[PDB]
Symmetry: none
Subunit: 175 residues, 2 copies
């Protein structure tokens, strides 16, 4: 019980208090799934396309790894939902870094082949040779990202194109 | 499986389907909760349960079962009537006898009445009646009344008001 009361407006819009939207990191545009509970409740929960995608991500990340041999992360808007190459305990279900959020917002794919000391997981700085990120934008809306990285090899067009292909394929799925 | 986006201003639209199956009208106040799983919960704010969610159905059952007249009151009026006529009792002010019986907190059985006021100021012919005060959290919040203008009440009906008062009480806790 937050015991916050709001009225529903003409148009059936209720405002979710900013407190809530922060403790749940719901940003403008975020999709929420609605349920009615037995008790008659209305239920709102973040809707993560990319995450209930469940195993596209896993299978995709696995293939990228078999093919390129680099570490591969796929995230929704909040956590990493698939990990290959690197260790799952390190990344799976962990909060993405701020760099990831902005890259996703920036909507454009990136390739850093130099400049080490990056954060993939919120608050953890990591040794890194190079990485590339392909934001997964479905319906103009960033809903996740694909990350390929290497702690001792340089990324090039090969891996850069690969995240673009992955992001594009995955995006299409969510449409 | 209906998805809606939250807008600038943190407003999500509750689909019209929902707003109908829950009869939420423009302006209605909704209480917000956050849950374990990080779900937001909205519920029509009053909140929670109140005597009368049940009274009708309960009084009806008591009548189908025992065939006597059944009244249920809150602290002021009769909120459910079965057996007898609704026009006679529904929304009418309880008698002083009812108020004191409720205060007295204890259930009563008058199997040898000749009269009784159920409604404030109206004396009524009565064979017998039994009253079960509805005490929730040690506090009388209503009563269940079974009465008969020509039959005697016994353990059957006496137990019945006790069961009804106890069940209804629990609801309000």
């Amino acid at each position: 019980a937050t015991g916050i009361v709001r009225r529903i407006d003409d148009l059936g819009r209720v405002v979710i208090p900013k407190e809530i939207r922060r403790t749940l990191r719901i940003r403008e545009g975020d999709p929420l799934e609605i349920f009615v509970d037995r008790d008659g409740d209305v239920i709102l929960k973040k809707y993560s396309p990319i995450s209930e995608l469940g195993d596209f991500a896993k299978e995709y990340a696995d293939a990228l790894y078999d093919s390129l041999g680099h570490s591969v992360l796929i995230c929704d808007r909040d956590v990493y939902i698939a990990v290959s190459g690197s260790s799952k305990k390190d990344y799976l279900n962990k909060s993405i870094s701020e760099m990831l959020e902005r890259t996703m917002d920036q909507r454009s794919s990136v390739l850093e082949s130099d400049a080490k000391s990056v954060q993939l997981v919120n608050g953890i700085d990591e040794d890194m040779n190079s990485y590339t990120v392909g934001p997964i934008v479905a319906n103009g809306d960033p809903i996740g990202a694909v990350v390929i990285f290497s702690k001792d090899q340089t990324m090039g067009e090969v891996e850069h194109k690969a995240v673009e292909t992955a992001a594009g394929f995955l995006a299409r799925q969510m449409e």
